[PDB]
Write a protein that holds these residues in place. Structure first.
Motif, PDB file in Angstrom:
ATOM      1  N   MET A 142       1.314  -0.921   0.143  1.00 17.32           N
ATOM      2  CA  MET A 142      -0.062  -0.800   0.539  1.00 17.32           C
ATOM      3  C   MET A 142       0.855   0.962  -0.022  1.00 17.32           C
ATOM      4  O   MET A 142       1.835   1.740   0.822  1.00 17.32           O
ATOM      5  CB  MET A 142      -0.658   0.070   0.939  1.00 17.32           C
ATOM      6  CG  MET A 142      -2.201   0.884   1.182  1.00 17.32           C
ATOM      7  SD  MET A 142      -2.767   1.151   2.555  1.00 17.32           S
ATOM      8  CE  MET A 142      -3.969   0.266   3.055  1.00 17.32           C
ATOM      9  N   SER A 175      -2.673   0.150  -4.346  1.00 21.09           N
ATOM     10  CA  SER A 175      -2.413  -0.752  -3.713  1.00 21.09           C
ATOM     11  C   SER A 175      -1.908  -1.843  -4.758  1.00 21.09           C
ATOM     12  O   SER A 175      -2.414  -2.119  -5.809  1.00 21.09           O
ATOM     13  CB  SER A 175      -3.356  -1.584  -2.934  1.00 21.09           C
ATOM     14  OG  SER A 175      -3.025  -1.246  -1.191  1.00 21.09           O
ATOM     15  N   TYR A 207       0.121  -3.249   8.099  1.00 25.33           N
ATOM     16  CA  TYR A 207       1.660  -3.736   7.499  1.00 25.33           C
ATOM     17  C   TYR A 207       2.717  -3.071   8.131  1.00 25.33           C
ATOM     18  O   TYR A 207       2.541  -2.181   8.930  1.00 25.33           O
ATOM     19  CB  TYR A 207       0.889  -2.532   6.300  1.00 25.33           C
ATOM     20  CG  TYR A 207      -0.636  -2.468   5.558  1.00 25.33           C
ATOM     21  CD1 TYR A 207      -1.332  -2.898   6.407  1.00 25.33           C
ATOM     22  CD2 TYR A 207       0.069  -3.083   4.600  1.00 25.33           C
ATOM     23  CE1 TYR A 207      -2.726  -3.114   5.380  1.00 25.33           C
ATOM     24  CE2 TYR A 207      -0.779  -3.203   3.927  1.00 25.33           C
ATOM     25  CZ  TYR A 207      -2.620  -3.869   4.125  1.00 25.33           C
ATOM     26  OH  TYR A 207      -3.563  -4.039   3.898  1.00 25.33           O
TER      27      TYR A 207
HETATM   28  C1  LIG Z   1     -12.417  -7.604  -0.880  1.00 28.05           C
HETATM   29  C2  LIG Z   1     -11.683  -6.685  -0.007  1.00 28.05           C
HETATM   30  C3  LIG Z   1     -13.698  -6.336   0.539  1.00 28.05           C
HETATM   31  C4  LIG Z   1     -14.251  -5.099   1.339  1.00 28.05           C
HETATM   32  S1  LIG Z   1     -12.509  -4.557   1.401  1.00 28.05           S
HETATM   33  C5  LIG Z   1     -11.549  -5.727   0.270  1.00 28.05           C
HETATM   34  C6  LIG Z   1     -10.173  -5.407   0.556  1.00 28.05           C
HETATM   35  C7  LIG Z   1      -8.875  -6.092   0.035  1.00 28.05           C
HETATM   36  C8  LIG Z   1      -7.901  -5.716  -0.159  1.00 28.05           C
HETATM   37  C9  LIG Z   1      -7.297  -6.562  -1.478  1.00 28.05           C
HETATM   38  C10 LIG Z   1      -5.841  -5.778  -2.029  1.00 28.05           C
HETATM   39  C11 LIG Z   1      -4.807  -6.308  -2.714  1.00 28.05           C
HETATM   40  C12 LIG Z   1      -5.270  -7.859  -2.884  1.00 28.05           C
HETATM   41  C13 LIG Z   1      -5.663  -8.517  -1.784  1.00 28.05           C
HETATM   42  C14 LIG Z   1      -6.611  -7.715  -1.126  1.00 28.05           C
HETATM   43  C15 LIG Z   1      -7.425  -4.343   0.833  1.00 28.05           C
HETATM   44  C16 LIG Z   1      -6.469  -3.993  -0.316  1.00 28.05           C
HETATM   45  N1  LIG Z   1      -5.880  -3.099  -0.621  1.00 28.05           N
HETATM   46  N2  LIG Z   1      -4.551  -2.440   0.125  1.00 28.05           N
HETATM   47  N3  LIG Z   1      -4.198  -4.039   0.496  1.00 28.05           N
HETATM   48  N4  LIG Z   1      -5.176  -4.669   0.874  1.00 28.05           N
HETATM   49  C17 LIG Z   1      -8.487  -3.460   1.006  1.00 28.05           C
HETATM   50  N5  LIG Z   1      -8.367  -2.078   1.905  1.00 28.05           N
HETATM   51  C18 LIG Z   1      -8.655  -1.624   1.414  1.00 28.05           C
HETATM   52  C19 LIG Z   1      -6.566  -2.472   3.127  1.00 28.05           C
HETATM   53  C20 LIG Z   1      -6.444  -1.416   3.023  1.00 28.05           C
HETATM   54  C21 LIG Z   1      -7.939  -3.332   4.299  1.00 28.05           C
HETATM   55  N6  LIG Z   1     -10.115  -4.043   1.387  1.00 28.05           N
END
Ligand SMILES: Cc1ccsc1-c1cc(-c2ccccc2)c(-c2nnn[nH]2)c(N(C)C(C)C)n1
Length: 133
Positions: free
Chosen positions: A42, A55, A130
């Motif tokens: 991120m 991300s 993180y």
């Molecule tokens: C599937 C899902 C449903 C509701 S929210 C959500 C989700 C998914 C991801 C994700 C991104 C890429 C690879 C794997 C998962 C991330 C994320 N983005 N960056 N890291 N994880 C994220 N976020 C907002 C994080 C900041 C918590 N939310």
């Protein structure tokens, strides 16, 4: 200087209860399994009043740019089309996503040398931690 301590590149190190959070959101089996494996980076930056959060991962890449308090369109990693508003509340970035009559809130916090992300859907919370990349 509003988000100085958030700026940087952050790598996921731990995830707790994320499968149940995704279930509560409505994510299907295959997306849950593949998304749950990923260890995204991120990347948070600020230019003037515009905050960008990217991300990058094996699964999906996402990117949002926004002004605090100003609603925008977002395409989430799980392919929901949501209307999002991000504010700063007590030094926490509070990200609310609205779609199909539903709502989820994602809080990004600086704690020690970590970025701690709490995701809440109804009564289900997930915590993602993180480290600097
Ligand atoms: C599937 C899902 C449903 C509701 S929210 C959500 C989700 C998914 C991801 C994700 C991104 C890429 C690879 C794997 C998962 C991330 C994320 N983005 N960056 N890291 N994880 C994220 N976020 C907002 C994080 C900041 C918590 N939310």
């Amino acid at each position: 200087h509003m988000c100085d301590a958030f700026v940087g590149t952050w790598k996921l190190v731990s995830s707790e209860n994320f499968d149940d959070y995704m279930k509560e959101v409505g994510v299907g089996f295959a997306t849950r399994k593949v998304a749950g494996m990923a260890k995204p980076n991120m990347i948070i930056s600020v230019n003037g009043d515009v905050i960008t959060i990217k991300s990058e991962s094996t699964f999906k890449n996402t990117e949002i740019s926004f002004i605090l308090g100003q609603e925008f369109d977002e395409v989430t990693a799980d392919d929901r089309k949501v209307k999002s508003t991000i504010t700063l509340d007590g030094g926490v970035l509070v990200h609310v996503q609205k779609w199909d009559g539903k709502s989820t809130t994602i809080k990004r916090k600086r704690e020690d040398d970590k970025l701690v992300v709490e995701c809440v859907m109804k009564g289900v919370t997930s915590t993602r931690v993180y480290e600097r990349a």
